[PDB]
Amino acid sequence: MLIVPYNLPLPGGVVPRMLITILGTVKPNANRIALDFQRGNDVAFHFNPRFNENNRRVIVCNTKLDNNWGREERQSVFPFESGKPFKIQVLVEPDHFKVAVNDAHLLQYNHRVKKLNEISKLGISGDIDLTSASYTMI
Numbered sequence: 001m002l003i004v005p006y007n008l009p010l011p012g013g014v015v016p017r018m019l020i021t022i023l024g025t026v027k028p029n030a031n032r033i034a035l036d037f038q039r040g041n042d043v044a045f046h047f048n049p050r051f052n053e054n055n056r057r058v059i060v061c062n063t064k065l066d067n068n069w070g071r072e073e074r075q076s077v078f079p080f081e082s083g084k085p086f087k088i089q090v091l092v093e094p095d096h097f098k099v100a101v102n103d104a105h106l107l108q109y110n111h112r113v114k115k116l117n118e119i120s121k122l123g124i125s126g127d128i129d130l131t132s133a134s135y136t137m138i
């Protein structure tokens with residue numbers, strides 16, 4: 001298994017048609033998972049499944065600019081399960097990140113950070129066994 005937290009460099013940042021694939025298994029008693037697409041210290045796209053926020057499961061997405069979190073976007077559709085293998089795919093589109101989990105569309109997150117070619121790191125962290133993290137063009 002890969003080390004968590006894991007850094008995946010994104011050389012020259014992201015661009016529309018870039019597909020990022022994360023394979024792993026959720027730990028049995030999970031609390032949270034995070035993907036952080038970073039531009040230096042800023043987080044262009046934070047994707048944060050929470051398994052127990054007020055006894056509900058929710059996806060929180062946000063952006064961090066100058067060390068400050070912005071307005072959260074919430075998705076109540078929650079395809080993860082403690083103990084189970086998952087595939088997260090993040091497809092960069094012109095106006096948004098598109099996320100599919102286990103080959104089913106989950107959400108989109110509109111670009112707040114404009115300089116896509118400076119979003120040069122993906123951090124992966126939280127309650128997972130991480131199998132692989134990769135990217136390709138489509």
Ligand SMILES: CO[C@@H]1[C@@H](n2cc(-c3nc(Cl)cs3)nn2)[C@@H](O)[C@@H](CO)O[C@@H]1Sc1cc(Br)cnc1C#N
Pocket residue numbers: 032033034046048060061062069070071072125126127
């Ligand atoms: C708890 O922190 C979380 C942040 N967070 C999660 C993680 C990690 N997850 C894993 Cl997995 C490993 S590390 N690190 N930072 C982030 O999810 C943020 C999204 O808006 O919400 C709160 S901070 C926050 C943001 C807003 Br807007 C309002 N209040 C608060 C607070 N407190």
Ligand SMILES: [Cl-]
Pocket residue numbers: 001002003006
């Ligand atoms: Cl590793």
Ligand SMILES: [Cl-]
Pocket residue numbers: 112113114115
């Ligand atoms: Cl920007």
Ligand SMILES: [Cl-]
Pocket residue numbers: 114115116117118
């Ligand atoms: Cl760009």
Ligand SMILES: [Cl-]
Pocket residue numbers: 038039040118119120121
């Ligand atoms: Cl970066």
Ligand SMILES: [Cl-]
Pocket residue numbers: 133134135136
């Ligand atoms: Cl790769």
Ligand SMILES: [Mg+2]
Pocket residue numbers: none
């Ligand atoms: Mg540069």
